[PDB]
Structures are given as structure tokens and as C-alpha cells.
Ligand binder design. Sequence first.
Ligand SMILES: [Cl-]
Ligand SMILES: [Cl-]
Length: 162
Amino acid sequence: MNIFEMLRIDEGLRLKIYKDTEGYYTIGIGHLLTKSPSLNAAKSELDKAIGRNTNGVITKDEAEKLFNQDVDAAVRGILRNAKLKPVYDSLDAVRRAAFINLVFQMGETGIAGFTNSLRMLQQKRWDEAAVNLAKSRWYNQTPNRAKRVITTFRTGTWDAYK
Ligand SMILES: [Cl-]
Ligand SMILES: [Cl-]
């Protein structure tokens, strides 16, 4: 198991524009297109991201390409972020994948306040961090995915995902 397979389980793959859990226009492997309500604004962004007139549909290859870009940008953002970087550095390989998942999902941004959880993770207080992470809109909105991520942080293994 690796970050790609992990996120592919969490996000699924859809080749036609769809709405995500928050109601946003998405495509592929969790690739957010726009937060606007307009399906046309979504088709426009999609064509712009693909470099072709897509009519809201892409191929598996095109989906995989967006995915590779997005994981690369997720990692790079973490490494550029002064709050994130030290946590990431401190973690083992599995837990690093858990942190990447969290950022892919919610942006460098929204996780902005796992301030307390982040300090807990850096300190390696696994159980306490898992408890703190669970007190979040994140956990309440997408409880099954949150549980898997949380378990990866607690345990440092891929058990939640076999
Ligand atoms: Cl893009
Ligand atoms: Cl879920």
C-alpha cells in the first residue's frame, strides 16, 4: 500500500463530472473543479485543466494524470508550509501518507487548525492525537474515511486499508 492506492480507495474514480460530499463539482480521483454552483463554470475549469474540449467527460489516463499532479502538489504544499513541514519531517513513512491524505482532502488551508492535533502528532502521542482529531467537523462529516485516516495515525500501519 502507498499514498496513491490509499487515496484511490478514499476518493474513488469517476470519469464524469460529479458532486463531492460537500456538493462541489469534481471529477476523476477527488480532483475538485470549482466551488461554484455552475456546471458550466465546472466544464470550463475541466477543459482548462485537461487542455481539450471535454464536454464533462475524461479518460482514465487523464484522471490519473490529474491525480499524479494533485498528490505532487499536496506533498509540495506540505513542504512549503512552515506549520506542516516540521510535523511531516517528524513522522514515519506510513504516518506521512496519513498526513498527505488529510491535506489532499482538506487543503493546507482548512487543516489549518488541527493546531493541537499537529502538536500531538509531532510529540508522538498517538492515542491522544486520534482522540483530538475526532473532534472535528471533518470527522463528523466523513466519519468512515476519517476513521481510516485516524487509525493510520494511531497505529502507524495500513491495517484500516487491507
Ligand atoms: Cl489543474
Ligand atoms: Cl467516509
